[PDB]
Amino acid sequence: DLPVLLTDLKIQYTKIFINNEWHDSVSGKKFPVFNPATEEELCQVEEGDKEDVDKAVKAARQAFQIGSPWRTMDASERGRLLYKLADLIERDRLLLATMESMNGGKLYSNAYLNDLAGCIKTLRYCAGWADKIQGRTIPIDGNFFTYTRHEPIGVCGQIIPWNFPLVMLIWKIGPALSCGNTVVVKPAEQTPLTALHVASLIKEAGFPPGVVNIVPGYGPTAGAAISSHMDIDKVAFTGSTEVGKLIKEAAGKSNLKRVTLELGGKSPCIVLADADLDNAVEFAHHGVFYHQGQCCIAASRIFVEESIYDEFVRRSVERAKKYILGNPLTPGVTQGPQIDKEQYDKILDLIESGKKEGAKLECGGGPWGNKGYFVQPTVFSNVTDEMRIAKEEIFGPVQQIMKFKSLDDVIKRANNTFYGLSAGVFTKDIDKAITISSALQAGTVWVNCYGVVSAQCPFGGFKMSGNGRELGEYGFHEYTEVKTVTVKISQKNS
Amino acid sequence: DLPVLLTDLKIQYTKIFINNEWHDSVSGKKFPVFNPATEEELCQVEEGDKEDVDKAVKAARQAFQIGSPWRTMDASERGRLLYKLADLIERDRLLLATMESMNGGKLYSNAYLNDLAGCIKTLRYCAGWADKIQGRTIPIDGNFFTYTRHEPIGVCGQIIPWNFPLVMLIWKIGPALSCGNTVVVKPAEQTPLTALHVASLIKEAGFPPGVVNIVPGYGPTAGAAISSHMDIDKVAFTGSTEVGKLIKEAAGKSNLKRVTLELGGKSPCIVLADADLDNAVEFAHHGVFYHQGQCCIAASRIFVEESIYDEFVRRSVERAKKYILGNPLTPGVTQGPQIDKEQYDKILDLIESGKKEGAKLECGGGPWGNKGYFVQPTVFSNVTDEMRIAKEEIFGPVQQIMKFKSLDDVIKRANNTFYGLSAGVFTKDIDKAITISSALQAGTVWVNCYGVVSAQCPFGGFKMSGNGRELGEYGFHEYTEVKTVTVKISQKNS
Amino acid sequence: DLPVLLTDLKIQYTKIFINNEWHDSVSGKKFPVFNPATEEELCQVEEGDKEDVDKAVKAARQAFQIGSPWRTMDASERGRLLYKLADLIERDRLLLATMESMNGGKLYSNAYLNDLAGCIKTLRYCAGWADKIQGRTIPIDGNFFTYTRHEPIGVCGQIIPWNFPLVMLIWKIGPALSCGNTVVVKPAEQTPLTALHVASLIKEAGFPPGVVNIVPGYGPTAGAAISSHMDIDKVAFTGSTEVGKLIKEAAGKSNLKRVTLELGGKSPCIVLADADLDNAVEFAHHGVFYHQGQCCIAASRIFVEESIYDEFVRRSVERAKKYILGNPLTPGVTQGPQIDKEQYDKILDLIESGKKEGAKLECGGGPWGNKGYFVQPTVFSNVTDEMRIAKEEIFGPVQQIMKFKSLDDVIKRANNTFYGLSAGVFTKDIDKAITISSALQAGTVWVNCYGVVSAQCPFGGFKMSGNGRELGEYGFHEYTEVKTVTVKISQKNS
Amino acid sequence: DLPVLLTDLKIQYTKIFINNEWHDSVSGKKFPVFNPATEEELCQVEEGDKEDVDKAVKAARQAFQIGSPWRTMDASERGRLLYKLADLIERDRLLLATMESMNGGKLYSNAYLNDLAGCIKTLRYCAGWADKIQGRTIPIDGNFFTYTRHEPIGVCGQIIPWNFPLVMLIWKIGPALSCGNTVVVKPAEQTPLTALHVASLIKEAGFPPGVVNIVPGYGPTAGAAISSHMDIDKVAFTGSTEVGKLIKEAAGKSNLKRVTLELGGKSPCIVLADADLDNAVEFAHHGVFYHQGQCCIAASRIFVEESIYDEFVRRSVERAKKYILGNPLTPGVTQGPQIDKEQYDKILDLIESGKKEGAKLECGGGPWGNKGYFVQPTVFSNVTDEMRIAKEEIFGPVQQIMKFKSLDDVIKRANNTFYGLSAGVFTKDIDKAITISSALQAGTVWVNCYGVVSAQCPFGGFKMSGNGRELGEYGFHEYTEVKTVTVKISQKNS
Numbered sequence A, B, C, D: 001d002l003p004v005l006l007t008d009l010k011i012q013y014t015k016i017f018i019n020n021e022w023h024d025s026v027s028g029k030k031f032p033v034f035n036p037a038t039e040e041e042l043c044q045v046e047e048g049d050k051e052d053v054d055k056a057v058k059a060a061r062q063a064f065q066i067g068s069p070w071r072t073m074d075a076s077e078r079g080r081l082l083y084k085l086a087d088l089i090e091r092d093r094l095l096l097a098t099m100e101s102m103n104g105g106k107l108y109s110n111a112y113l114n115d116l117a118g119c120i121k122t123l124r125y126c127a128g129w130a131d132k133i134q135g136r137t138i139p140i141d142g143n144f145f146t147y148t149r150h151e152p153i154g155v156c157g158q159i160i161p162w163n164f165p166l167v168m169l170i171w172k173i174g175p176a177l178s179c180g181n182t183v184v185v186k187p188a189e190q191t192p193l194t195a196l197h198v199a200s201l202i203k204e205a206g207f208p209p210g211v212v213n214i215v216p217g218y219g220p221t222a223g224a225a226i227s228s229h230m231d232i233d234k235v236a237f238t239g240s241t242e243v244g245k246l247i248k249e250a251a252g253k254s255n256l257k258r259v260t261l262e263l264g265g266k267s268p269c270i271v272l273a274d275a276d277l278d279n280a281v282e283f284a285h286h287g288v289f290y291h292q293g294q295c296c297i298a299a300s301r302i303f304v305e306e307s308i309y310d311e312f313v314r315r316s317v318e319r320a321k322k323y324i325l326g327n328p329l330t331p332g333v334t335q336g337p338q339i340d341k342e343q344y345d346k347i348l349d350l351i352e353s354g355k356k357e358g359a360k361l362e363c364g365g366g367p368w369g370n371k372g373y374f375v376q377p378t379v380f381s382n383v384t385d386e387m388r389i390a391k392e393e394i395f396g397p398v399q400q401i402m403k404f405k406s407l408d409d410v411i412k413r414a415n416n417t418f419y420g421l422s423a424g425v426f427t428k429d430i431d432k433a434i435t436i437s438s439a440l441q442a443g444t445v446w447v448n449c450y451g452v453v454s455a456q457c458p459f460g461g462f463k464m465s466g467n468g469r470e471l472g473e474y475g476f477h478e479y480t481e482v483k484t485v486t487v488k489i490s491q492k493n494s
């Protein structure tokens, strides 16, 4: 069941959030924010730039100082604060879900039941870790007492994208804060609004000032100032491969800050003849079309064994043909728009490449409507490995389906990409499930399912799909700095 | 006790080591290798360059392929292989120690009793981990079985320096191999020889071909080809901040490979009035002069509380004045040369800056001898925080001593550097030992000792002194890639 | 600040709690419950016996069955349920604290500010673990996939004592439930009431029926039926050494169930001449007198170095002489009664042994008041190691102080006991703090403090003070059963 | 390939081993040791009793004292010592294997290729852990530094059985010693000889005296003195349920020492219609007949789905009919004797119960030969759940095969036993493999294999099959005692 906001959303928070107060931009400049389903302005927002990032970094540094309230509070109280934020987000769930849908072009049903839930669940997960982050005592050679501290790193700059604005903000802040760090978050220029509202809830929960700062703004302005900043200790980023490379170079040129990246993919599924066919069709379908194709882990190469390939394709087309396009707020609407003009153009251009390069068009294949950055859900069959639609992350509702006969051949083809975020394997054979999943060069491999992401599991890429892991026990590693303390003693005993 | 080689060292291995065979350089070119204590050529060595690195990467990739002997062997057998290599290195300890001393300008006493021991101990430590690297089973939300694999990453390029050629080679290969990776090692152009001999012992132990490849050569040639290579998954590096930055940028520009760095420091000691004074003098002394100052963790800023500062300085000068310079092979010689002309020039130039900038010269202060890159052991007192000798890693036998009265002031001064590899605290106060060590922004902090490094402890920098950690349990994290496998099931139970 | 219940406590829950419903005893029998400060009946409570325990075990077994709601729910939802229970306990904190004080003879100030807080903090701690309990994937020899499950054990019987009725109930259920077990709790015959109220809050939070069952009753009746029961998988117990031994034998005779025990102690402090004297006096004082001496970790042997021994004793007597005895509900009252007649008799009898055996009486030494099981706070100096008051856990407000000159001698004396729950070390010497704490045969050692117990730390005894550990990461180990699953595969890869 | 001892085994070590020296029994008494294949005396051995155990405990206590060589040596050197012992055992492998075969009635092929290998592999595994056992640093509430030490426990008494005398000795000592404990081992009265030889190799490796003591002798004499001893901190035991219960009661009555038990089982296999039939037959066959049925994890209930049940039975009988009985030293001999008269009688008596109770005799069913405790390999089909051969651990070469139609029914039947050491599941269905293995109440579950035991995996029972786990990472937990140290500090920082 699914409830709605009984009143019309009114936008309130549109300023830069530093030391728990609302600032105008140093420049006085502001920037517009649109609804992608209508192409209308929703409001203006203060535009942050290097000067404003330099302010937020100073605030974050200050909040991190030895002796400060964020450093001296019990770790269990950092956990409490996060737990409270989660309760507050749950309180304003209608709201947040509506603003997410409206600003992000995200179906309200998903915004409410999935994104909002994932934020809340992820925060509570991270809250639980806070007083469970532990170092070691170590039986070193010689007469010494050695222990390690898993300290927070320091000031972490976090640049996040427009496809899951709330989920991504919580993926970034939840771990960073649980570990004791301070943060300067730069949301996507497209979608600053849910993050500014969450800033209001950070202040209301009671986080010390300067622990979380949020600086709306553009990428090459505000984002670049984060990646090149001499007093930011770590940057985390989700988005394009292009920018991931810039961020990394910038970090090398500046202060050798720590860098973690998540950068999308061209994730493959391998469907064996023995697979439960309908389950495979369903998961691969939802796997590529979710949020209009705008998932890093979109199942954008589906390799099906020859003998079921035609049945797979036909069932996939039947399912793709059942969508209702329109405004993500209206019940029964099952596909929203793409986020903006740039993505719209890229998607249409890649669809054209597919027609031109000889792929078989099964359905969709062009735009839709008079306003909104809508794209008809599109299926291509008989796709081959050198076509643009097989190589490049599309990030639109465009499904590629391809055949294989040889199992060693298809694993090489699945692995033959600089991407490596995720993969899917559909089979009833125990041995093949284990061996295939071992052999795939991907950070997450699903067996007989797809797109299952949980707070308890580390998530990240092999190869150019990123470095590091987020969430799970393992993800917390990227938000600590280990210090070894070795103390001379007269005589050690085991 | 200390034994020696009964015969004169004869050099045998001077070629590139790829797929367990000895190759000449693609170019035919060779490069000379010197003894730093005499400035004489010891031999020529094949000079590897991009072409040769492209060969070694192909070999490493091949050895890493699914189904290969290195991927399918039991993890306990990877451990055995490392254990055997350690026994072989122990067998050829006289030898190795002699070649290390002769090529590296390292006192034979240290080469034998410390470096060689650290290599052997470190290898056995790493051998033990091999079948103890484990993933997780994870109680994810929903009806799924989720587990993680901590796989090896893949082909790791490892560029190492000239100050601890053997120890560094083992620090790099020991973990990488224990975790299951393959490697392409580029030793320092100055000191390839002990590494080629170890390659002979890798072949003799039985490592599959292509698991370890060693490509002697220069930095901007062979080293750069590693850092920019499109099929190397990870690079590890110890050396200069300058190159660390290049390596990182290169990795960003190329294939976003994983990068870990160790980059030296300007490590501080803080000596409180209550410290056991003689213990502090001794450890800080050995801490800065070890291996002619050529330690990443050299104790190159010693802050002493005013009331014991003069006694500290006088005792430090008395100890510095007791060295015998000369050839590192001769018993009773207690200081060898610096590695090469570049380091010699840098050290003399920094000493001059100290005289010029007003520091107080207590002893030494210029070169020594008719041949060899020798520098008299030098002590400067009344040094201040803006002088070059207080800011820049010297990497020579040059000790800085400075005073403090204010404890909060001295921690800010100790932290006021882009470095952060290590620090030392000397006090009898329990509270101060814990609070000071917590407040110092350094990767290792010693209390009432200095320079204690063990295989069981993670080791690495805060800030520009590096990223990542080596050794200990924690260090193994940087040589694995985590994959999450999530399997759909009918019904889960706790 | 300290608030109170605005209305007079009315007792409501007095029945056996099985499958979330309230049962009368099979026998029809009931038993009285007293206030120890007045010796008046507070109510009658259903008296559970073997028959009633057999009912609760059947219910717990049923709730544990594969496919049941408690086994299939997400681990994160077990965490939620515990978190909710913690919020409910916080809601009824006035209440609970009042009933704890009234039934338990516990100062209301402590009941409210310490016990109630510890319950809430401990529950939230345990809630956080629930979805963070993880098994392993293991690189076994041969072509196998091996993983482990850290399953709940099953039905856990938990017998708890009268000194910290609420804290102990939460220490027991929090971990057991977080790990996924079901429980049959037998509270102390003296103090069933706060636990029955918590049962009401378990039902209200939404725990599936049969997950927590609470059977008030006597030790040799209901407690013995738990320890000898053929379908209880684990028993946990806090209380007397005598019963700990019976429980263990019973477990051996019956079904070899798992057993963990916490059994008090005769915990020593060692105060060195260099110790901060006032801090030592204060912590050792509060350490032995807390809750009328009725702490398992009471600091009931204080060894002070000769040269400060007289000053220590005098300051200790000054502090002991400042208590106000009376009803634990009245503000400014700083010592309540002992729990019951048995403890009262034991304490007076041991005090008499101290007078008789030649100890020096500094203050107190007999009973107090016309009603209530009150004992004057008593200090004995010049106590020696063979006197009853040095050997036997008193569990009353009776402080022993003794001298030492020899440090090796005093560690042997501190260790010379079959107990080993905890110890205290007071010194400013870093080396002595580490070496002494290493050498003491005790489960928790405090340095320069005493009595610091936190949810994040494992807690339990060496030697006859118990087996196993509670709380911390480590404590969760005792509430899981590890299963190894080993799956044959065609070919493994690292 | 399989080598043999070129000379006739001569027995040398036959005395009690305390403080690395050979002692006669206090009583002067000696006891005989037999070969089970001939019923001839091999030698006499000193008979240890309470007095001798009291000697070994004093020696172990002494070697454990703070300041002793075993407590102060580096953990890495404990690892070295174990590694050396493993090399020595490998050196004397011919030997040891021959004595194991001759004394134990174990096929020499298995003794050499399996037992001896498992000992060596297990020791090297445990050697690797020694300096990797680590405590924690813990972010406790309040201004404290808290860390934990995972100390050795102390003196561990280890009573081991006659079926795997060498493997069991190494399973016990390897972990105990790696963790830093001292031990008093009581081998089986039947099979002391390989353990005394290993004692000689312990002395030769260089273990400090008193670290390992070995006291041959009887169960109710020497074994009971261990279990009831007031200065033994822990007992570990593998053998009968009967004695496991006595040991536990004894531990409760005496000093509440820690107890771990492994106690055999009645382990079930479940073979589904879709299973690879020949693989299932093979593994279940070897699974019950290994070492003449004398495995704790013998697959002694095989449930086969009706539709393949007859084919399963026929193939199982064909395989059972191919054994050659005789002397375990002669090549091509594939079944040795049972260990002694007691086991021989029990096995024949249980076989008779099977005939009498209506089971179907497929082959074997009585004794063999003129000397030796030989039993013909016996197969029973149509066995039902209430027959003695379905309920009681036989520990002889007697295979039970039974049918099922209902999958929920067969899991209840498999679980319907107080045992729970291990189980086997044979299926090609992924879902069933996971769900069945989850639902089985057994410590190890194999899928599509059986009897796979490795040093890297924890091993132990659910229910009356034991408590605790041996080996793996997890097994080390049972050989440490955790101490929490909590230090007061002026101000903590994260």
Ligand SMILES: NC(=O)[C@H]1CC=CN([C@@H]2O[C@H](COP(=O)(O)OP(=O)(O)OC[C@H]3O[C@@H](n4cnc5c(N)ncnc54)[C@H](O)[C@@H]3O)[C@@H](O)[C@H]2O)C1
Pocket (backbone or CB within 6 Å): B159, B160, B161, B162, B163, B186, B187, B188, B189, B217, B218, B219, B220, B221, B222, B223, B224, B227, B238, B239, B240, B241, B243, B244, B246, B247, B262, B263, B264, B295, B296, B343, B346, B393, B394, B395
């Ligand atoms: N222990 C420590 O941290 C220290 C140890 C040594 C010096 N440390 C510091 O650096 C200074 C310069 O020494 P150099 O000797 O010039 O080091 P380089 O960093 O260049 O180090 C040489 C190693 O890097 C390879 N290299 C060079 N250029 C390269 C390139 N463009 N791409 C890839 N690789 C390149 C090179 O071939 C060799 O293998 C010293 O004075 C120390 O302060 C700290």
Ligand SMILES: *C[C@@H]1CN(C(=O)CCCCC)c2cc(O)c3ccccc3c21
Pocket (backbone or CB within 6 Å): B114, B118, B164, B167, B282, B283, B284, B285, B286, B287, B288, B290, B291, B294, B295, B296, B297, B298, B450, B451, B452, B453
């Ligand atoms: C170079 C650094 C210093 N060092 C010492 O052993 C110091 C001895 C003097 C004590 C005050 C040392 C040892 C090992 O093993 C290293 C390994 C790797 C890098 C640096 C060192 C050092």
Ligand SMILES: [Yb+3]
Pocket (backbone or CB within 6 Å): A276, A277, A278, A279
């Ligand atoms: Yb289906």
Ligand SMILES: [Yb+3]
Pocket (backbone or CB within 6 Å): B276, B277, B278, B279
């Ligand atoms: Yb000294």
Ligand SMILES: [Yb+3]
Pocket (backbone or CB within 6 Å): B370, B371, B372
């Ligand atoms: Yb010169």
Ligand SMILES: [Yb+3]
Pocket (backbone or CB within 6 Å): C276, C277, C278, C279
């Ligand atoms: Yb004080």
Ligand SMILES: [Yb+3]
Pocket (backbone or CB within 6 Å): D276, D277, D278, D279
């Ligand atoms: Yb087969």
Ligand SMILES: [Yb+3]
Pocket (backbone or CB within 6 Å): D370, D371, D372
């Ligand atoms: Yb006979």
